[PDB]
Design a protein around this ligand. Sequence first.
Ligand SMILES: Nc1ncnc2c1ncn2[C@@H]1O[C@H](COP(=O)(O)OP(=O)(O)OP(O)(O)=S)[C@@H](O)[C@H]1O
Ligand SMILES: Nc1ncnc2c1ncn2[C@@H]1O[C@H](COP(=O)(O)OP(=O)(O)OP(O)(O)=S)[C@@H](O)[C@H]1O
Ligand SMILES: Nc1ncnc2c1ncn2[C@@H]1O[C@H](COP(=O)(O)OP(=O)(O)OP(O)(O)=S)[C@@H](O)[C@H]1O
Ligand SMILES: Nc1nc2c(ncn2[C@@H]2O[C@H](COP(=O)(O)OP(=O)(O)O)[C@@H](O)[C@H]2O)c(=O)[nH]1
Ligand SMILES: [Mg+2]
Ligand SMILES: [Mg+2]
Ligand SMILES: [Mg+2]
Lengths: 235, 257, 332, 352, 318, 330
Amino acid sequence: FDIAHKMLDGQIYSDIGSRNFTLNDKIALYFDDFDFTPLMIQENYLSTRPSVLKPGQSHLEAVAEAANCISLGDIVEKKIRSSEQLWSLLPLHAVLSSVYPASKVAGHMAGRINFTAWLGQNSKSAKYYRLLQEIHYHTRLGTSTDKIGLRLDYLPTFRKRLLDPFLKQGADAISSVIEVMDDYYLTKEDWDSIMEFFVGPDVTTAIIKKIPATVKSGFTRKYNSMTHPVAIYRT
Amino acid sequence: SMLEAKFEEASLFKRIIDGFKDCVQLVNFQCKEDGIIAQAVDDSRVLLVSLEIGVEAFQEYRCDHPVTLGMDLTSLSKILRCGNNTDTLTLIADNTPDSIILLFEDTKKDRIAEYSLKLMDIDADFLKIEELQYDSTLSLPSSEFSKIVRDLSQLSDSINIMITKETIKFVADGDIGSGSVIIKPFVDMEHPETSIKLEMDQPVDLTFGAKYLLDIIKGSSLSDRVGIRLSSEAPALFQFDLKSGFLQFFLAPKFND
Amino acid sequence: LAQQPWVEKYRPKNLDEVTAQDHAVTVLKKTLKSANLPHMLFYGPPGTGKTSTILALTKELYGPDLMKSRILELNASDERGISIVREKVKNFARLTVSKPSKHDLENYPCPPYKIIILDEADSMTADAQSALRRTMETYSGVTRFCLICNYVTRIIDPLASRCSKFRFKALDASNAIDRLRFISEQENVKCDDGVLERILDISAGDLRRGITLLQSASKGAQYLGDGKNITSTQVEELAGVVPHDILIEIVEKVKSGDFDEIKKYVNTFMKSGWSAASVVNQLHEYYITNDNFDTNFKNQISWLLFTTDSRLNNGTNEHIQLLNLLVKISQL
Amino acid sequence: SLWVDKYRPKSLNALSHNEELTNFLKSLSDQPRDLPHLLLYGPNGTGKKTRCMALLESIFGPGVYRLKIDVRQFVTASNRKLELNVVSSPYHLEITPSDMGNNDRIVIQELLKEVAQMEQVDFQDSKDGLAHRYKCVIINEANSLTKDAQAALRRTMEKYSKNIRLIMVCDSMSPIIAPIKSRCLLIRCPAPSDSEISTILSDVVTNERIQLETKDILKRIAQASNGNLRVSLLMLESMALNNELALKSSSPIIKPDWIIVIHKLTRKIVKERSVNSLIECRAVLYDLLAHCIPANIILKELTFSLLDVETLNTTNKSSIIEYSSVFDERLSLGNKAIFHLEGFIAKVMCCL
Amino acid sequence: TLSLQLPWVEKYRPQVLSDIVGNKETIDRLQQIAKDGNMPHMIISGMPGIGKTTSVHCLAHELLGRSYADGVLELNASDDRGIDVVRNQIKHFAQKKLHLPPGKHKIVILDEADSMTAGAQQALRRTMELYSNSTRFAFACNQSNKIIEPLQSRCAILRYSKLSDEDVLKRLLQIIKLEDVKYTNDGLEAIIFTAEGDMRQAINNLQSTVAGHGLVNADNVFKIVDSPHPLIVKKMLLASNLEDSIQILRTDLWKKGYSSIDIVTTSFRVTKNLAQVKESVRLEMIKEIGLTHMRILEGVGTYLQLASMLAKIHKLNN
Amino acid sequence: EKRSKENLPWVEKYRPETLDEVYGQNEVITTVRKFVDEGKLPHLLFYGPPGTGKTSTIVALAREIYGKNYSNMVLELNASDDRGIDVVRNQIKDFASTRQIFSKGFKLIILDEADAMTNAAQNALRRVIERYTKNTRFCVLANYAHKLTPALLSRCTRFRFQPLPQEAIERRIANVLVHEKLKLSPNAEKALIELSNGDMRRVLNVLQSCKATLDNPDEDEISDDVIYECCGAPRPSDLKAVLKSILEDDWGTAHYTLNKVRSAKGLALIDLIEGIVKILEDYELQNEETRVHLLTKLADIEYSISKGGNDQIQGSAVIGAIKASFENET
DNA sequence: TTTCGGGGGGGCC
DNA sequence: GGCCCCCCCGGC
Ligand SMILES: Nc1ncnc2c1ncn2[C@@H]1O[C@H](COP(=O)(O)OP(=O)(O)OP(O)(O)=S)[C@@H](O)[C@H]1O
Ligand SMILES: Nc1ncnc2c1ncn2[C@@H]1O[C@H](COP(=O)(O)OP(=O)(O)OP(O)(O)=S)[C@@H](O)[C@H]1O
Ligand SMILES: Nc1ncnc2c1ncn2[C@@H]1O[C@H](COP(=O)(O)OP(=O)(O)OP(O)(O)=S)[C@@H](O)[C@H]1O
Ligand SMILES: Nc1nc2c(ncn2[C@@H]2O[C@H](COP(=O)(O)OP(=O)(O)O)[C@@H](O)[C@H]2O)c(=O)[nH]1
Ligand SMILES: [Mg+2]
Ligand SMILES: [Mg+2]
Ligand SMILES: [Mg+2]
């Protein structure tokens, strides 16, 4: 947080400030925490009122230039963490990921400095990708597609076949739904995972909560009262 | 074959190799009509090992022309472990060989195990570093030397040997403290195997690394006595005599400063 | 044999079966008598006969039996880290050469050294390459190294300095027609005049691709059961070359200059599966070799095509790149 | 079972579009003993995997369709344990190494080399008990393989061709390196035409007994799929379910949620151009990426939706397509896709 | 022919604190501490070839007199200094009993303490405190930031400055007087110019001269010594025209044998610290230099790439 | 080795054995000879580009100091041997702190290719070097000076190995020709020196390939043509013709000329680009932007070529870039 | 978070 | 004593 506050300050980037706080000092400030400075800069470079705008330039144009340099720094980072271990490029990354964009949007923070949100989002993405892989390999035998094709095309129709019936015919849907699951070696956990993927106008959280408790209890009882096949043995 | 040398019991060669496998990596054998002489230098160029197995140690030994064999002691030990400790061992080689053949034969049954070890292009000379006139030459049981080395090495990583008139002193100066062991020549007619002999020309004082002495003492399992020859400006000689040959460790003393 | 692809079945068995690499095969043959083979670094584009050349050299040097005891071949499928380089390669290079038999010495030259072939060496890390520098020089009297690569820039400068360089030229209709004609004759493939030349031109330096295309055409002709000569139209169809009608339609749409029409046409075109590289190559051929355009237009289109090809070489989306290139050309 | 999978053809004679490709595959299967390595490339959802399975069924017996899933274990240099789900049949094997990301290389060095370097026991249709045939390995999403993973295939194909034959399937050939493309027979798989899609949908409807007011319905569904047959079948099933197994002239075309989200994002970008708008766009992008929506798909759909706006001029469209090309290249060379997507959106906002 | 002469760097290594040149205030403080005693825990920081190890050794020797061999425990990067070593050997040394003059204590010298791991530094914390009445610690490092904050809190900071030209000239003149070495003023000026405040390099070059050619003059020094290539890179990057920059790059760097990677790294470092150019221009130049550096790392390291980098830099600086 | 030295490659067959056989480094050789002739041997560092004679020089110096048995009196380590922190702390320390086994004298440690060593090992080497300087001397050899730590450089006396001069290369070629019974034309020698770029390894390899190329080396003379076919390099006439066509002909003529020139001998585009760059760097361009555009575009094309791509498109890009850049001349 | 390689420090044996 | 495993940096 302190690094982000200091590096997103317009004073140091002015002629006098640059004379006192030099570029070497900025690179050292980056190196103080080289694993979190780029993420903090990327997170907090859109929430400032700049004081370094060039004559005729707007805030949006400076933001775009900073984003372009952030993308270039991301490419350099990918090169550093590779099969070649090109750590000698760490200083260049310092200029491409943190220093240059801040110098382009340096000013006064317009709000509270926020912690980087990329780590939680990445963890969520990894969890959802693992769930998608589980569903894909639980339904590979009956489907002709990849995981991406399964997510983008198959899952909506599976929702129409699996969740809509419960909302229309009440408990009577259970049997039918079970059949569909049996046709694709699907389990209750897979059912929930599939229901947890949709976004936008097709979010099922509220609808699923609105389902009657008795209907869900009967569905669970029917599922646990039968014998189901297994797609993969000893997962 | 060009070279055929039979060991009655494979344990003999296994023990001889076991005496210096922990201090060198690559060995060079050079077989002649008068036995097998081998040399090995350590990675630090501080210790040299010279073995001179004679022809009297083999059931039969035949060698037409001198033959050189560069080998790695790790692979040799690995293969020798394969053979049992109750079988005859034939070393076989041909003209300018590309491999050395170890043949384990068990006369009890009709089982024959042949192992071919690929040789290495090790080109080096021996230089016969056996400086003519040393300054002091002592001989004492290997057990006492091993005990002294093991006791003193626990104090310091360096051990100093002083040879004075009728006095041999081993000194170690470590962190927790220091330790000195003094032994004077003595003879027992009842049991001469335990006697200590010293022939002295000029006083000697030489320092050595404890690791190298700890490696060297492993040869006590081959001989009941050890001969230590010391001379200033020359490496120290530690000789263990065998049934027909011997094993010599030449250890360079540390610089004084 | 009859159960093997033609590319492997017509792999040069000896150094006399290499078609258009005489500038290096000559010195390689001379080494068979001189017995002073230097460290070699083969580099060139795909399908020029580098692996075949080294394998044939090994055939002619040691023979079928002594080969396995004198050759150490490692490729990208094998782990070649710094530890592997410092242990396995070093140990093999330190060994004495295997003993030749009386037959081997009576028939084959049997040079007094072994060979280590690091195929696809461009996939090795810089540290692993540096680990080989002194190994190559110290044991040059018992071992020789052959580094085979496609991108010579990926080999560190010291290694390239230590190795004698051999460039394998691209194989075209002027220097590889004889081998393709021989393969067709042995396989009894009846083709119209200029079909083999068209195949070699489409291959663009890759004789393996040409042989595969010839095999595909032969299979099609055999399955057709008409006893008719293979034509260039079928060869182009099997090679994924865009028909000239589609190309003239594309250039006409570009000449129109309307963004929406160009976008619609590209959307329809992308549904046929044509590769963007072929489209770019054919557009370059059509534009650069046309007298209807001025010098400035060609100057700009050359750079535009170069940029598009470089971007496509990085595994980018073909639809977006093709649309961008066509729009930019239309605005020239 | 969905209609998309319940009516998939299982033989080369059951294919119903691109008859020229069917004839080419039949010619290839006529003498399969010398079949070279194959690389099938074309648009998504056209039927490439179906054609590969049909070719395998033509080469071997109908038994290629008895698939079983097994788990293979791998160990990295750091001792980390990895698992790969392999689909196998008595005649062929299937792998998707990209599932392990940068570790896919290990597969090409451990699994494939294990299959090709050893013979296989075949106690059916054989007298001695040893297979007298080559093993066919199918690599799916071959365009997703790392460059070193692809390089690991070269000598494997060039050395053990007598025992292993590879049929790779990809959507684009640009990611494939030149040596691999040179080592394979390239097969282009054109997308089905609108008439063929309409015929397939009509057959499906007749089999399922779905009432249709007019056949033009199936035409519109064909146009909305942009040549994707899988999407066409799934959309037909969804519309039939949402219209009580009866499609009328007024039945809307159902689009998936992510497309609607991307269209809303495009509308927002067009309407508002500021840094606050960019912050909300970042939020939407994070939401899209967290739900297994690939970044490249997002970029392509966003670019085309922006270019399909009836308010922008030619200059705006040219700038948008140029930025899309540049940032697609950036994505291909980068790791954090959110950075490149945000940069592209910011540039588009600036140009507009 | 097999006997070696002691280098002047070791033959004239200062043995008393009065012979250390530069950092007059700190040396005076050390001398007064030696005169009185009660040495505190200290950390001496600086850059290579300034006299940190010499200062610590001289202080310890003068403080402990004949008891140097029993009251000084010296450990450097060539010795094992892990957590176990700190927890056993150093602890035992600190707990050791030894008789010393009234105001003297045992000394634990840790040369190049920066390389020490965090665990060992943490373990040293309470050891430096429980036994401060008999043992004191003197760390010597190049980068003070590598020493953890708790350790810095317990010690006195002694940051050394680079030796000025006057001090280097004084010590060099003393050495010349002792060795009776013929010299010229320009030769000494060139030696100082190449030294860059490093006394070790100055003495080494002075020995190489005389040993190589004899009389010390600019000609011989520059015959054996090379002007620091960073200055050449700075001149290349500050040329008014592209022609001059390319001429410098070719004649002075490429034809002299300098590698492309070295040239690009030096250009990056020099551009970082060009206080006479605006920050934005420097950042653009650094972006271009980074592009060229990545290209060179990929394997394409050629004169053409460096020429293109210079052309782009001149494009920016216009 | 195996058999006589005639089975070795020329790069290894002609390796300098003494210090008077090293050419092109007169200053360094004289300085080191004077140092060894008076016992004033400091910690040496040899910084230089590939194939300049650093390893040969240090081995010759070791042979001069010790003799034929130098291999038994020095500790030589390189990138092929592990040189971690443990190695420095045990093996190097033991070697430096111990007397010679075979014969008296000081200890020499040659860390060849030290630029590959890690920072930790170099840092550990500092006090090892500084403490045993009384009886041990360290020699370091490097091609990249940025990998060496500042302290290690401070502790070493630097010697720069320049790219080999023209005169030294000619003298070595004369010796090789005399020993091999070969004849070389003056233009052949000119081409060999030009393509060598100051590396003797390239000279020896190309000369061996030229000898192999000749059908009857006994009385055949090596000409520039032999070099050009052996190396596959473009002829100067070809480069001049291509540049002339690019500069004063239309696009069709330039394309035809480039294609014909390249297909005559199967020349590579990269060599042509290097040749044209060398030719143009001697031109007197009126406008600086012309040179700027030429350099930038040709560097971009070279980088693109380094990763494959389409050869025809790359050649057309070269032609168009040259034409556009020269348009600025006016 | 994170793709090798090197070093340390502990746990089985 | 030796493997075997896990954790942690990497620019100047
Ligand atoms: N000079 C050639 N002469 C005859 N056939 C060739 C020649 N070059 C390539 N081929 C043919 O193409 C096939 C493959 O040749 P390769 O030796 O594998 O080419 P390559 O250059 O080593 O491949 P790369 O660079 O690793 S992609 C051979 O089996 C031959 O059938
Ligand atoms: N102030 C000085 N006065 C006289 N000689 C000096 C001085 N500083 C360094 N030297 C000389 O350079 C040699 C080495 O000095 P050192 O004390 O080793 O430098 P250092 O700063 O401790 O090295 P580092 O920081 O571990 S790289 C000394 O033996 C002296 O001969
Ligand atoms: N000055 C030279 N005089 C004669 N031959 C040389 C000279 N320099 C290099 N060579 C020749 O090139 C071969 C290799 O020389 P090296 O000593 O290995 O060069 P190097 O600079 O040490 O290589 P690097 O920097 O580790 S890539 C020698 O066998 C010589 O035949
Ligand atoms: N009736 C019919 N359906 C096909 C045909 N080819 C593909 N399909 C259908 O289209 C769906 C998608 O095909 P698929 O091979 O998985 O697409 P791809 O792998 O992305 O190329 C499949 O579920 C098939 O049912 C065909 O020739 N005839
Ligand atoms: Mg190959
Ligand atoms: Mg110091
Ligand atoms: Mg060298």
